[PDB]
Design a protein around this ligand. Structure first.
Ligand SMILES: [Zn+2]
Ligand SMILES: [Zn+2]
Ligand SMILES: [Zn+2]
Lengths: 163, 159, 154, 156
């Protein structure tokens, strides 16, 4: 699609790495390959990619995602947005940036499924975006919450959730 | 204690363990009215101008008894989140409210979305376990934990 | 690509009749013609009204169209039609990206609504014949603001 | 009970300097300095709000000495309105702020839009006539009366 954007939520060393402060360990690490391939997909079409990061070394992007970001961060289709709450839209210009660019569809990847992803997805929903949350592209430390949130995205938010 | 409002989320004929919380909700409505504290009935707009859209049961009866009072408010909403597209935030700030108690249904949908907006907007949040309910146990329990561990809410099991 | 809606701001008897919005009497006929032109295409029309009945021919036109799917009535609590209302989400639901604003007062309710529309990324049109203010200085200041700062067609 | 913050709107080189890319804002410099000093004496919070797209003169020099303090904040904004797309309202609410004083430029553009949003969000507003300026003297005068008569502001 041409009116689509990728939202990469809080994929930082502190959340993903084993020696990270508030880490998610292995599950957040198991989505690295899928996120890297979603970034390349969007970049191929010069679709817009937003890296959304909690503001507070540890706040650098994790692993291959952080590596890829270093090589594309100057491109006009790549954005880095500091956020102060879990919800990527709260107190940020994200919605206005998407609207400027005629985006009405977001794909959301990152961590955690039932916190920052969920809060971001709910705001995307209220703001009238079409939503995709691929189950291979999100993770949580809480298995019950991960499964709870994927069904919430599908059944309450009308989101495409591909297994 | 002092600067508080009650949000009664979506407690309608059409959505209503919803009947099991009826008595607790009525007592919380009476508790806030017992101090002239502000009570907001938030209702999805559930066809307009129909009987399925009325407040259910004893809660509906109590509402009819206090609806004209200046501490009682009825707000129509268009999404699950009670704050979205409504003047709820502005009405709470007019009245120097920094504390909300949230009751009604469903725990992991309208209550959750309302709680998240409350949280983002800087309100202190209490969601008593006895005053919310959901169609599914796993969502109910997930949401009560979310309220406590992520939103910093008070989620008292017993009052 | 242009997808448009008309915002009719605070065109009420209490603002307009002789019993700040009083020059709103001047614009009755032009507002009616805007509503008729949008309704010819089935474009969406929003009547925005302070929540503290529509004046004249606009009121009589409203009764013959009020039940149609393209006609909406929204209560507001501040000057800004977008504040504390579902207006932005109703526009988004319908893929609207341009709003034409008529009503009163040019430098108050129209001004606050236009700024919100601008911030939310809507293209704006405020025809000079479709807005009034008893404050002629403010009227003239506000129309220049729309054009010069909000990028509006005036 | 009043708890106040200072909003210093768009007092940059390019809006104020004779050579600035999009330039009477020079004449309010000393008054803005005194307001910043007055709020800073009490450790009241001060927010510098700047278009994204450096602070002018004595305001910039003063900022360099206080910028690391917990009561001093720098906020980038993408529209005229200081509240739009920014965490400004959340930062003010976090600190129990209920009143804002607005200074800077231009009276009838970024100050106006900032003030309208503060009004809608329920803040008590002060816009001292000596602390705001605009090229458009007609818009300056219009905007000042608007603050007093529509937004219930204190305009001293
Ligand atoms: Zn954090
Ligand atoms: Zn009003
Ligand atoms: Zn600019």
């Amino acid at each position: 699609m041409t009116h689509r954007a990728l939202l990469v939520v809080d994929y930082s060393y502190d959340f993903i790495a084993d020696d990270g402060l508030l880490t998610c360990g292995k599950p957040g690490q198991n989505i690295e390959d899928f996120i890297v391939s979603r970034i390349n997909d969007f970049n191929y079409y010069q679709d817009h990619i937003f890296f959304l990061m909690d503001l507070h070394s540890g706040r650098e992007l994790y692993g291959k995602v952080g590596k890829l970001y270093e090589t594309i961060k100057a491109q006009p289709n790549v954005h880095f947005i500091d956020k102060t709450r879990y919800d990527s839209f709260f107190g940020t210009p994200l919605d206005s940036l998407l609207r400027e660019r005629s985006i009405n569809q977001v794909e959301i990847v990152g961590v955690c499924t039932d916190i920052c992803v969920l809060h971001t997805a709910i705001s995307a929903y209220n703001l009238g975006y079409k939503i995709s949350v691929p189950a291979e592209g999100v993770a949580s430390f809480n298995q019950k919450g991960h499964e709870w949130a994927l069904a919430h995205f599908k059944n309450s938010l009308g989101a495409e959730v591909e297994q």
